[PDB]
Design a protein around this ligand. Structure first.
Ligand SMILES: [Mg+2]
Ligand SMILES: [Mg+2]
Ligand SMILES: [Zn+2]
Lengths: 611, 263
């Protein structure tokens, strides 16, 4: 049969037919042998009422069938933590056992991963962007930015690898092109619409603790690492004068939306190296603050603006990069200049009186000291500013710290009310420990809860119940105290949805209202009924929960959360499974893998099974 | 559309029909298929040509669960990420090509020792006749209570006869192919002769202690066997129907037992 002969014999037998077909093609269609052969074969196949095979052939020719586009296989390989050798083994095994090439080779995957890395698509800027090169095909670079590693210089042993800020932003925009197009189509907008697109971006920076992989040989080195990443929060566009949010992130404080800029191995407390590494990024950011990006992603020129907000900084880093003292200062509020002593007296009445410019001014005053005053008065006049700030930060808090602080205060409140201290002026520590033990036993017997000094979120959540306060108040006489505790718990549960909703302007505006009223009522109850807790101690978390909540709400409008061991495990997995040696290409490879992992395109191709 | 292309290519259609009736005699299908394949291969797009040949000849799209289990074992893949990749590929390609963990575990427990029956002409004293048991405790019922000799080395083991018959069963195909190649039929009886070598050696440090550093130099050991010769004596002489190509390899070392004990 003809199907049993080799291609050579079939060619020798059908040379005349091929010549006739190609000459008809070049005489009628004008050198279109491919299309006419495709159509003739499709008609010959449909001549036997084979519509299933015809549809399968059309799907194969279109490429929407069993093709496994290199993007999909790249996402699979980068998500399942698959190395190159094992992936090639699987590919060749499947190709040999199936016959068809369902997966993709290695060079196709390399092209698919290079088409997504930063420094590929062209762009431009309306301002010249001084002190910034115009080259647009650069990717991973040394984070030291021309270090001074000579022997006669300050020694430093760090490996910093980074992307360029504008390149990373252009790559993220080219990645979310499809998402923003779909969003603007769903928002009832035209397919052709120029900018400017107001892009609000969140900034974050945090360490990774320990990333050492020493199996044995004792604790040789701690080897602390640190990263620096950003996250596009939202995109807005207007039609004339009315604005409309065209893109909003579903999970802002997640792991799959962490776009990394730089990765280095340096301690967070190491100030000089951190400053030397982060100065170029801060310079690029302050130069881009007032620029205009121009891109050609949607076939037409699109203009882009940017608004940066550094809210992803924890307390330990915001008390160091801002110039304030780390932990020994009397000043605790990162927004107000209230001392620890005045905070215990004034509870709610405060305001945000801190900014970057005023911090620079206070540091300049501290350095110059034109009044020639003593050290203590100068310190209390500069409000604890000792170091020069170089990063404009926007501090924020989460609900976890607020609730754990409230629960830690209420625990001691319960101890003080069960110990009958309002009639005993000076008690003993052993008597208070006996009170604590009795309360713990009573709680474990009635509510069946396990007490522990190590406090966390689950303990604070399970302790804040009406049944708990009822069970701990039914033991003490003078039901007036029971009514006081009832009012306190009621005010607490009324204030909880304000910071436990993530959107007070839409979820519960009535809960957001009367906030100052109930806060003043709580302060008056605490200062009159519980006129004993005034021992000169106050927690900064409790102060921020009392006073600086409405201001933060008016500034942003949400609280959210920050999942502690989230990035370190991923970094260790990337460094162990798919990474190179020599400690030079290791950081570049882990950064590239993390960038491919945090890509919205690959994640969208992955989670598409829910549909 | 269809009518337009038919009106434009009816001449080519009737021409190909006449040429096939003259040369092949009513075989336009094979002629057009071969022409399409030759065109696509001359276009230097052999991928689509091979895919079309496979989908036209009747090649199956998916694969057997055995191959999936094989690649999963040889790539060191977990279950969660394997299921993730499976569902992702099933959603992308639409059809089901891979196999879920159900049939995978089914084929796994089928291939494991202690599944197919067997027997022995001698009673095999001091050995039970049960034939549906696999992994068991290597302590062999050693009482390790408070009033006995202190011991805490966890040990697991197979049954020697069970692992032996499992190895024989998984090499049945190879030995049958060898017997067919060595001028022998299939309805042959034994007694086959199998040369089995045993080996065991320690491993050294197998504990990745990272809580505080080097805690204990935990050493492990494994006892294993290997089949490297299968012969049959027919008539006067014999013929080696199976000879291992490279027995000194880490791919045919069938393990019996594992212990966490020092050598
Ligand atoms: Mg931190
Ligand atoms: Mg040895
Ligand atoms: Zn404050």
């Amino acid at each position: 049969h003809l199907l049993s002969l080799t291609r050579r014999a079939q060619k020798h037998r059908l040379r005349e037919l091929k010549i006739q077909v190609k000459e008809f093609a070049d005489k009628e269609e004008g050198g279109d042998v491919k299309a006419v052969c495709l159509t003739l074969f499709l008609l010959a196949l449909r001549a036997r009422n084979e519509h299933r095979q015809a549809d399968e052939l059309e799907a194969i020719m279109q490429g929407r069938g069993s093709g496994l586009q290199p993007a999909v296989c790249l996402a699979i390989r980068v998500n399942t933590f698959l190395s190159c050798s094992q992936y090639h083994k699987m590919y060749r095994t499947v190709k040999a056992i199936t016959g068809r090439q369902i997966f993709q080779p290695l060079h196709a995957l390399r092209n698919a991963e290079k088409v997504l890395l930063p420094g590929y698509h062209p762009f431009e800027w309306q301002p010249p962007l001084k002190n910034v090169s115009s080259r647009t095909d650069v990717g991973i670079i040394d984070g030291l930015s021309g270090l001074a590693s000579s022997v006669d210089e300050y020694p430093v042993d760090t490996i910093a690898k980074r992307f360029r800020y504008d390149s990373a932003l252009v790559s993220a925009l080219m990645d979310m092109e499809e998402d923003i197009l779909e969003g603007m189509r769903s928002q009832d907008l035209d397919d052709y619409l120029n900018g400017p697109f107001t892009v609000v971006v969140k900034e974050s920076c945090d360490g990774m603790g320990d990333v050492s992989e020493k199996h044995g040989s004792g604790p040789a080195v701690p080897e602390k690492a640190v990263r620096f990443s950003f996250t596009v929060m939202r995109i807005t566009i207007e039609h004339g004068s009315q604005n409309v949010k065209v893109f909003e992130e579903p999970k802002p404080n997640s792991e799959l939306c962490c776009k990394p800029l730089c990765l280095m191995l340096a301690d967070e407390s190491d100030h000089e190296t951190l400053t030397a590494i982060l100065s170029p990024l801060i310079a690029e950011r302050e130069a881009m603050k007032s620029s205009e990006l121009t891109l050609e992603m949607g076939g037409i020129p699109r203009t882009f603006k940017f608004i940066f907000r550094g809210t992803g900084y924890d307390e330990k880093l915001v008390r160091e990069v801002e110039g304030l003292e780390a932990s020994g200062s009397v000043y605790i509020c990162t927004l107000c200049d209230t001392t620890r002593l005045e905070a215990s007296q004034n509870l709610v009445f405060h305001s945000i009186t801190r900014s970057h410019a005023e911090n620079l001014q206070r540091y300049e005053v501290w350095r110059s000291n034109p009044y020639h005053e003593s050290v203590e008065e100068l310190r209390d006049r500069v409000k604890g500013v000792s170091a020069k700030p170089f990063i404009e930060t926007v501090p924020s808090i989460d609900a976890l710290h607020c609730d754990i602080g409230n629960a830690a205060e209420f625990y001691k409140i319960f101890q003080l009310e069960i110990g009958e201290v309002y009639k005993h002026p000076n008690a003993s520590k052993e008597e208070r420990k006996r009170w604590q033990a009795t309360l713990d036993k009573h709680l474990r017997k009635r509510m069946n809860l396990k007490p522990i000094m190590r406090m966390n979120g689950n303990f604070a959540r399970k302790l804040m119940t009406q049944e708990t306060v009822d069970a701990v108040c039914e033991l003490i006489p003078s039901e007036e105290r029971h009514e006081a505790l009832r009012e306190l718990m009621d005010l607490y549960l009324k204030m909880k949805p304000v910071w436990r909703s993530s959107c007070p302007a839409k979820e519960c505006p009535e809960s957001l209202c009367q906030y100052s009223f109930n806060s003043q009522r709580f302060a008056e109850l605490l200062s009159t009924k519980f006129k004993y807790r005034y021992e000169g101690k106050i927690t900064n978390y409790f102060h921020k929960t009392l006073a600086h909540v409405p201001e933060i709400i008016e500034r942003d409008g949400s609280i959210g959360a920050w999942g502690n061991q989230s990035g370190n495990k991923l970094f260790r997995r990337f460094r162990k499974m798919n990474a190179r040696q020599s400690k030079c290409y290791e950081m570049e490879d882990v950064l590239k893998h993390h960038w491919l992992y945090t890509s919205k395109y690959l994640q969208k191709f992955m989670n598409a099974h829910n549909a």
